[PDB]
């Protein structure tokens, strides 16, 4: 009579499971008078629980009812016990209680199927339920972004030219970069040595992989899986992708090129913000004294009242629609690289034997993803300022201003949104109101959202690592101001797009 | 590139294994890795792909849906039947016969 | 009350909205 | 994880021997599972 | 029988019976 | 054929309690029938509130599936059984367990208490019986006899005291004493899963799949046959006025006359929202103490509280 | 949302000129099962749709359609009689269409089309 | 100012969506899993 | 007329799969902290 203790809990659970299955069907729903095949029925039981954990449909062509809802009852509930340990060893693990290693390592297995289960279903449900950026949401985002490049006479970056002078140059860039992953050399394996001789190839004879890559640039539009995994950071997880290495040179030689037009002709306003000027903390100082230096910007005597706001996009990267974004694309560079882009987006996704197709969101691990992501960013960007406190901010084309900087006092002053940065998907705003602007905000929120009982207090969130004296007073006027201005600035943003 | 012979042997080993053990299949053949071979599996040898010619329902439904979703050949194949590489191929074709 | 052999997929031992043509279109105009 | 008293790990004369009479036996099961009349192995394998 | 036949021959064993068999055992 | 059956109103759906996280696998009412106790897979005990249906309490010591429990009349203790072959004494003062009882070899199924004495017997899938003294976490008798999995223990105060169900389909009645099978009953044809014992009648019934059946103490001789449900029964249960109440596991329930074996209702419920069809099924009934209402347990997660009409006359729901 | 010039026109032009659509409306029948034609297993939906997230949920199982001249041969359980009117006289003809149905059928059905009118017996030993 | 913005009033009648309330069998598809899915991965 | 995903709700609601007779409690988290005993003594 030993008992179950920590190593046998998995073992007892299928023990018990098919102990009761043997019982309660195949000898009370039994007229399989000889043997009722008990061991083939339990194979089907087992079958039926790789095909969840594959997300397969599973199906058995003529297998009598009874069988099958005793099949599917006993699925659901091996499916359910599966589940919720998932569920109680993430939060052990999030707060810090096991330093098991064999547990960290089932739950990222079983957090990485669960995740490709629900992947999987987002985009079968985007084909059935529709795009969900409607007609009069996608033609005004295009129509606003053609407004915004052609009032900074944009010119388009052209297709990559095969007698072009820097080819060379943002090939050697970008065969360093794939190099640097490879620094260390250890035992690697067989992919990663085909990684490693492609990229020494391609330094032997520079002008051989140019061609190839401007091939692929014209004629490939189907391309191969991707892999995916999970990086354990113990409080979320971290998606990583695998490309295959020939598709990696072609993708590092075109985000290099295409960063390099981007910036050469100033398609990002100096709001979009991993700047090669400065880093993070002389951010954080050039904001800081950017705040400082706005005019009068902390006297209170007549009323006015300062919000510094910041927030997320919450589902950027998830949410790109793949045919708005060829066409907003195409408006930015040739059409042959605009199409690459958007069919590169559109593969194939495999975890051992999961296998399904990205048709929705946009894949990060390619290594153009960071173009595109801040250049949809910038559409955004527009949605929330506007065209005309956005192009005041970017200042003429023909004399930008810089990080925050008004060409003038009285452009400064004239809109409450004074200072704007956005980080990848980090949106730091800073407003600045007169006290009849306060209260028209006050009032257009109070009026929609009635506060009767004084709730407003109760949501907010102040810091609360600095003492007392130092966090925020919750003051009606100001946790109304905060709310307003913040119902304000989610009204911007269509909610099939993003949101906050 | 596959020569008709290791995809024979391809052939045979899938028939014998089954399509998930791509590891000792890919340990059958010389120069092949199990991500080749699956991949070859489900472009070309699989008797479920068709080659044959495009009926023009299948033309007009290629037309259509190659304009309504520009560029996204593997959601645009399993509409219609065919693999991407063949929807292209087929698509451009047709392109160029029309231009 | 006779129950298939099991054969199996692993033992050896489509829809789309009509709005997606509203969109395309809409954007192409 | 390993374990005591084991030899090495097989050199590539040695695997590829054990591929080559592998995708033999192989080719001798589908010959059968078709059942083909024709085939015949000579005295030099 | 299939019926409501004699219930006091149904009727259950009374609390003195019931009292020495708990004490007994 | 017999006298015509006695008027029994018809019983209504009136609650659903939605708080488990797996099937549903046992019920038991306070004795000052103030709330109850449900056990189930997902290896909580919950205590709920009879009126409101309130979650008063929930208790997590088990390490599999909470498959009997049972609440003491004559303590505050409460025990249950799970399939992790241990068996707990929770105290109802503290919250917390106090006692263990070591000693089975595989899942406990159920078990009871002796409404005298300090003693508890639990049934276990090593075909056999135990029964342990209260206080002393081993078991002062393992009765055995049966050939396979045990499934369903009753234990009265009169004699026989202890009533055994198994899934060699047959019955036996042991003396508890001796610890030694004074009868076996060997009328069913497949598995017993439920038996019952009349509150006062000196009469029990014990039902399997081919048919509910009635037979007569000590001896155990046969009574009469109730047939109509056709189904993997799970659960009896009696009403002190002749209701039987037979809940079966493909989630049908019939109600009968004790008396004359005339089924007279059948509820067919519907299974809670995000459900399949195929997981309807009720693992445990239980009558109240008032015996005013009747809570099942259910495959579904869910508790389902029936209560009697009112509105109901033999000429509106007349006897067949 | 009249937001600008362009965005005005195109949807004015959008909204008169374009129909609804043909071929992803065929793609976004079930043929239902009377007391008859039910079969002892099901469609399947509801195991693919529960082991499958990239289905639409379907929790009520629904019985298959067992079959069709299958379903008529468990009926045709009595026999068959022809006379063949051949030159030699009539060729009086029994058959056990209930053990033989799909054969049966065969022969009485190209007898009923009369296509072994003129059918000559080529070989005699 | 606020003439410049394309997006009106995107939420009038947002009022709570009583999912947070409805409790589905399912493991999958009910709040708890969404909620835990949104907050851990990524 | 579009639902977006975080919405889409399969599985028609409780009180349409019983009716407006029976009423449905959903009871997570409960009442009554663990220190609080069910059966109060006596003192
Ligand atoms: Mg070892």
């Known amino acids: 009579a030993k008992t179950v203790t920590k190593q046998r809990v998995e073992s007892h659970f299928d023990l018990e499971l098919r102990a009761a299955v043997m019982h309660d069907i195949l000898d009370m729903m039994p007229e399989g008078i000889k043997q009722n095949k008990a061991r083939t029925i339990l194979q089907h039981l087992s079958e039926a629980w790789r095909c969840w954990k594959a997300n397969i449909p599973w199906k058995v062509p003529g297998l009598p009812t009874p069988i099958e809802n005793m099949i599917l009852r006993y699925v659901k509930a091996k499916a359910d016990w599966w589940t919720n340990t998932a569920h109680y060893n993430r939060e052990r693990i999030r707060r810090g209680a096991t330093v098991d290693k064999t547990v960290c390592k089932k739950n990222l297995g079983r957090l990485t199927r669960l995740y490709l289960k629900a992947e999987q279903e987002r985009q079968h449900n985007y084909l059935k339920d529709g795009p969900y950026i409607t007609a009069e949401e996608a033609v005004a985002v295009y129509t606003t972004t053609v407004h915004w490049l052609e009032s900074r006479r944009f010119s388009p970056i052209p297709f990559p030219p095969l007698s072009y002078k820097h080819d060379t140059k943002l090939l050697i860039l970008a065969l360093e970069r794939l190099k640097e992953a490879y620094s260390v050399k250890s035992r690697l394996n067989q992919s990663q040595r085909e990684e490693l001789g492609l990229i020494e190839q391609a330094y032997d004879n520079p002008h051989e992989a140019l061609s190839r890559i401007k091939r692929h640039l014209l004629t490939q539009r189907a391309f191969k899986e991707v892999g995916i995994e999970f990086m354990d950071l113990y409080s979320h997880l971290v998606p990583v992708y695998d490309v295959e290495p020939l598709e990696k040179i072609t993708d590092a030689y075109l985000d290099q090129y295409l960063w390099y037009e981007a910036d050469k002709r100033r398609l990002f306003p100096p709001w979009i913000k991993p700047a090669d000027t400065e880093p993070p903390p002389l951010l954080v100082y050039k904001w800081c004294q950017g705040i400082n230096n706005l005019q009068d910007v902390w006297e209170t005597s007549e009323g006015e009242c300062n919000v510094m706001l910041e927030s997320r996009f919450e589902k950027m990267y998830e949410k790109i629609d793949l045919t708005l974004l060829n066409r907003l694309l195409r408006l930015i560079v040739d059409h042959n690289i605009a199409d690459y882009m958007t069919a590169k987006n559109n593969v194939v996704i495999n975890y051992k034997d999961m296998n399904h197709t990205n048709s929705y969101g946009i894949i990060r691990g390619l290594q153009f993803a960071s173009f595109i992501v801040q250049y949809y960013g910038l559409v955004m960007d527009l949605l929330v300022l506007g065209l005309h406190r956005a192009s005041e901010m970017a200042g003429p084309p023909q004399m930008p201003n810089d990080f925050l900087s008004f060409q003038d006092i009285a452009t400064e002053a004239a809109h409450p949104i004074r200072l704007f940065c956005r980080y990848i998907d980090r949106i730091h705003i800073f407003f600045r109101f007169t006290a009849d602007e306060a209260r028209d905000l006050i009032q257009r929120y109070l009026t929609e959202h009635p506060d009767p009982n004084n709730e407003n207090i109760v949501g907010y969130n102040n810091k609360k690592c600095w003492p007392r004296d130092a966090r925020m007073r919750l003051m009606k006027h100001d946790v109304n101001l905060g709310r307003a201005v913040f119902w304000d600035i989610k009204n911007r943003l269509p909610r099939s797009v993003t949101t906050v | 590139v596959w020569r008709n012979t290791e995809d024979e042997i391809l052939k045979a080993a899938v028939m014998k294994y089954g399509k998930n053990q791509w590891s000792r299949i890919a340990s059958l053949l010389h120069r092949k890795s199990a991500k080749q071979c699956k991949a070859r599996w489900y472009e070309w040898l699989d008797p479920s792909i068709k080659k044959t010619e495009w009926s023009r329902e299948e033309e007009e439904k290629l037309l259509h849906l190659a304009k309504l979703m520009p560029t996204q050949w593997r959601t645009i194949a399993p509409i219609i039947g065919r693999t991407a590489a063949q929807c292209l191929e087929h698509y451009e074709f047709l392109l160029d016969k029309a231009a | 009350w006779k129950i298939p052999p099991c054969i199996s997929n692993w033992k050896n031992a489509v829809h789309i909205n009509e709005n997606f043509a509203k969109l395309a279109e809409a954007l192409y105009i | 994880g390993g374990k005591t008293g084991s030899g090495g790990v097989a050199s590539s004369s040695e695997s590829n021997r054990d591929r080559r009479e592998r995708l033999r036996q192989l080719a001798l099961e589908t010959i059968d599972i078709n059942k083909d009349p024709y085939f015949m192995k000579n005295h030099l394998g | 029988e299939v019926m409501n036949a004699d219930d006091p021959d149904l009727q259950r064993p009374d609390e003195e019976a019931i009292k020495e068999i708990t004490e007994k055992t | 054929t017999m006298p015509k059956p006695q008027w029994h109103p018809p019983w209504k759906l009136y609650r659903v309690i939605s708080g488990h996280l797996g099937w549903v696998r046992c019920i038991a009412v306070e004795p000052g029938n103030q709330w109850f106790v449900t056990g189930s897979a997902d290896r909580t005990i919950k205590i709920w509130d009879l009126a409101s249906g309130k979650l008063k309490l929930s208790l997590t010591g088990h390490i599999s599936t909470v498959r009997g429990v049972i609440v003491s009349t004559r303590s505050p203790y409460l025990f249950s059984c799970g399939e992790d072959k241990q068996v707990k004494c929770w105290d109802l003062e503290y919250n917390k367990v106090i006692r263990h009882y070591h000693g089975h070899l595989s899942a406990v199924y159920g078990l009871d208490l002796h409404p005298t004495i300090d003693v508890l017997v639990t049934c276990s899938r090593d075909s056999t019986a135990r029964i342990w003294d209260v206080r002393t976490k081993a078991s002062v008798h393992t009765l055995s006899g049966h050939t396979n999995a045990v499934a369903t223990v009753r234990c009265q105060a009169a004699e026989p005291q202890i009533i055994t169900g198994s899934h060699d389909t047959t019955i036996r009645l042991w003396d508890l004493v001796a610890g030694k099978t004074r009868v076996t009953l060997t009328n069913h044809k497949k598995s017993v899963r439920a038996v019952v014992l009349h509150p006062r009648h000196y009469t029990f019934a014990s039902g399997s799949p081919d048919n509910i059946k009635q037979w007569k103490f000590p001896d155990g001789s046969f009574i009469q046959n109730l047939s109509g449900h056709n189904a993997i029964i799970n659960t009896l249960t009696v009403n002190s006025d002749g209701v039987l109440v037979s809940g079966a596991d493909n989630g049908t329930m019939h109600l009968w006359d004790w008396r004359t074996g005339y089924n007279f209702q059948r509820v067919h419920a519907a299974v809670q929202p995000g459900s399949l069809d195929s997981e309807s099924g009720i693992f445990a009934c239980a009558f109240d103490q008032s015996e005013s209402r009747l809570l099942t347990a259910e495959a579904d997660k869910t508790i389902k509280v029936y209560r009697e009409d009112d509105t109901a006359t033999e000429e509106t729901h007349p006897v067949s | ?125 | 100012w606020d003439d410049d913005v394309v997006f009106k009033n995107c939420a009038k009648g947002v009022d709570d969506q009583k999912k947070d309330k409805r409790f589905v069998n399912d493991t999958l598809r009910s709040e708890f899993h969404k909620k835990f899915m949104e907050k851990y991965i990524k | 007329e579009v639902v977006l995903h975080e919405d889409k709700k399969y599985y028609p609601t409780a009180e349409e799969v019983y009716g407006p007779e029976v009423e449905t409690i959903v009871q997570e988290e409960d009442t009554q902290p663990l220190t609080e005993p069910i059966i109060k003594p006596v003192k």
């Open chain 7, 1 to 125: 949302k009249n937001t600008n010039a362009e965005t005005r026109e195109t949807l004015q032009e959008l909204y008169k000129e374009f129909k609804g659509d043909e071929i992803l409306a065929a793609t976004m029948e079930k043929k239902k099962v009377d007391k008859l034609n039910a079969a002892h297993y099901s469609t399947g939906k509801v195991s693919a749709s529960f082991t499958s997230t990239a289905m639409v949920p379907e929790t009520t199982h629904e019985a298959a359609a067992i079959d069709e001249d299958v379903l008529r041969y468990q009926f045709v359980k009595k026999k068959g009689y022809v006379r063949l009117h051949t030159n030699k006289g009539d060729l009086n003809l029994e058959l056990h269409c209930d053990l033989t149905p799909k054969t049966c059928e065969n022969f009485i059905r190209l007898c009923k089309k009369h296509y072994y009118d003129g059918t000559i017996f080529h070989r005699s030993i």
